[PDB]
Symmetry: C2
Subunit: 283 residues, 2 copies
């Protein structure tokens, strides 16, 4: 037996301006003979917490080749960290994915540093590897704190990406500080970007496990009620509805999914809609 | 260009008794330092059309390590074909995944040959890679024709696997045949296996795309109606309802998913439930 190769992909390390390391993983349509096959305009999706989602995003994109609405696909860019034996870097992502606030603890509030890194280092590095390709449109995907980053990017630098995909965004973080930025975004006078927001139905209302003691289950329900995933997301979507600075707002509750399990569904739908259903109908 | 290495995984080739080659891809929990870390009873899931689903199943399994209901995980076995630039082998799978019938065209009806290969070659080969591990329980997953195979395996050799996961089963292929097998299964006198059946809500009732012209859309709806994915699946589940030979029957319609897109959802939920929520509650 041999190691499992991943075709039509590559990875490389990049450093931000602060000297901190990133692992960038890239994949392209499986039907290409090589990286140089692609010419002309293509959509591109940037995925934060890259280590956790790259393979699913890659393979889901490849599965679209059999679908009738396939239009040549696009490029997957997973922005991750040097890791062994796990999918998340807790320390690094805590800084990279959370917006700056006066009461944020030490090691949080580095979202603007990270967004600058994505725009000024990751984007050109990817463009240099596909010199024949034009970046037709760009999407930023993130999950949990990653979803919080996606929302922050939309509200403070809306021109940076064409589409923002916030999967189960941690709106609860730091006393709902993201709503200050959302308010400022809608109240500013006005091509508008699009937003996709999603969450799992079990996040705010989790079902009981088999053999789980009642006291343990009630503790999980208490925590779920505090995080308020669905209702915070619905309140935000209500605030943004009818705003001229958004082209489209698409919201989805995934029935029977929790914070972990929803990731497979949300990244797959996110890239599929961005690649095949663009532009979205006005909403 | 450095290729993307896949950790905690391997692949090897295996030939059936006819000399036809199969690509067997295997992955194990990411937190294991090496493959010999695994000791004692573990669940195992066999996935047909292995090339299309191995990476998503693998990464979805790894994402479970961050979930509070994680119990240790299991082994993913993708049973596929030697392929380049594509995810399916149309000729090979047409034989391997369809049951024998008198009216089946040439190149179909080899499901029992394939199921024998899985049980007598793939299973012992995988067991030999983990000699310190015992197989606590075994699941068979397949999608489309693969879902038909899973149903066929349940109805004709129910003792072969503990759980059968039929994603969007192609019941249309020979409705008389697979429903004949289902009827015989329920009418036979009686540890019972479990069945998960799923489909996407857009399979039988697809929405119109943006800018799709009417004749093109009506043709898609006509095809969708003929395949009858939802109603054939519901008819089958109604026939199996209250059957003593089945421990549990779980049926799921994924809202807003088509035949391709639902694969990400169904394989992820399938392995998660089989790994973490076993045994299922009685139906």
């Amino acid at each position: 037996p041999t190691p499992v190769p991943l075709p039509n992909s590559e990875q490389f390390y990049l450093e931000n301006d602060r000297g901190e390391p990133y692992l960038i993983q890239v994949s392209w349509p499986l039907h290409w003979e090589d990286k140089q096959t692609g010419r002309g305009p293509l959509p591109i999706i940037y995925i934060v917490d890259g280590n956790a989602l790259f393979l699913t995003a890659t393979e889901a994109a490849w599965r679209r080749a059999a679908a009738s609405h396939f239009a040549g696909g696009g490029i997957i860019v997973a922005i991750g960290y040097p890791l062994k034996g796990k999918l998340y870097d807790a320390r690094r992502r805590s800084f990279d994915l959370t917006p700056p606030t006066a009461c944020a603890p030490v090691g949080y509030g580095g979202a603007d540093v990270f967004l600058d890194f994505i725009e000024n280092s990751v984007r050109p590095a990817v463009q240099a590897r596909f010199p024949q390709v034009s970046l037709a449109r760009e999407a930023l995907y993130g999950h949990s704190y990653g979803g919080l980053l996606a929302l922050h990017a939309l509200f403070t630098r809306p021109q940076s990406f064409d589409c923002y995909i916030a999967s189960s965004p941690s709106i609860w973080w730091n006393s709902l500080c993201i709503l200050h930025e959302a308010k400022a975004f809608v109240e500013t006078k006005k091509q508008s970007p699009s937003l996709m927001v999603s969450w799992g139905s079990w996040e705010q209302h989790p079902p009981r496990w088999a053999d789980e003691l009642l006291d343990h289950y009630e503790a999980r329900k208490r925590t779920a009620a505090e995080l308020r995933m669905a209702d915070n997301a619905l309140d935000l979507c209500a605030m943004l509805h009818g705003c001229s600075r958004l082209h489209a707002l698409i919201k989805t509750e995934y029935e029977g999914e929790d914070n972990t399990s929803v990731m497979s569904c949300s990244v797959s739908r996110g890239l599929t809609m961005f690649f095949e259903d663009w532009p979205f109908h006005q909403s």
